[PDB]
Amino acid sequence: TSQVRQNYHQDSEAAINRQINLELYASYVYLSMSYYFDRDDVALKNFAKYFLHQSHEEREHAEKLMKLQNQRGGRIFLQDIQKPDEDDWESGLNAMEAALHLEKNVNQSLLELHKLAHDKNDPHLADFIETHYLNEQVKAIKELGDHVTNLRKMGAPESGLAEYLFDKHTLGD
Template sequence: MHNSKARQNFMKECEDAINQQINIELQAAYDYMAFFTYFDRDDVSFPKAAEFFRKASHEEREHAEKLAKYQNKRGGRVCYDDIKCPKKTEFNGLEDAMETALSMEKTVNQSLLNLYKIAEQNNDPALCDFIQNEYLHEQEDAIKQFADYVTQTIRVGNGLGEYLFDKMTLN
């Protein structure tokens, strides 16, 4: 065990849950890199989608860093797990990618809700506040955005519709 001078009212269960969330965010960042590199390929060539997913990867990595800084602030220790190879590195168009991303964001959101519940059960209002203000609202926005994109990519279809979606919607 460690002897942090900053640790106060910070239970091991909360520390472990934060570590789990850090690793989930890093996995999402890695997965979004696969989206980026797929859409950046010359035989796929959706440049706005590539940039959109590159930014999504960067954002997930920032989420992990913010959680790691919070863990240190509270006197916890960051523990990293192995990051697995992305489950999908090829997509059947933008609709498939948006559906996959929507599912990922829902998984991340559920994990954050579980973290919030653990914080509540351990009487940690500071952690509850941090998760709610820094993550939950943003996750709701991301889920809505990807749900909209799924609907829109279905509506426009493949071919020219995807091209126009990439060119005019993703920025």
């Protein structure tokens, strides 16, 4: 067993490995959505930028977790990364709703991880989640919610005008 390990339960170690896989999956989902808005029959440059940025942020989530794992003494075990549910996201509104759903999923997974960490009385891991992950998910969900509300009040996804204007006036700057 690793010389640095201390107060690191194997249940925690397994949760960390699962969370790593999930963050990588989310990165894959966001990559999918981004290049779906790059298509010549969708053509929403700023939606594409937005989801590409979110993809890279989830990738950094994963890497932060892997470094945490090696720091505590656990061992990283990588699994396959599943293909996203869809290859075609229909609209900007629907991609936003999907992203909101995905982030609520990852949030619940993190909440159960923090619960397991408090239960195995691992306060350092509990605070690592408290600091680097919980509030980022709260912000991400509130932001996606704002986006969904605005796109809806504009008549998306019926009005193609709505998505075109949103792309310019919100996801530009």
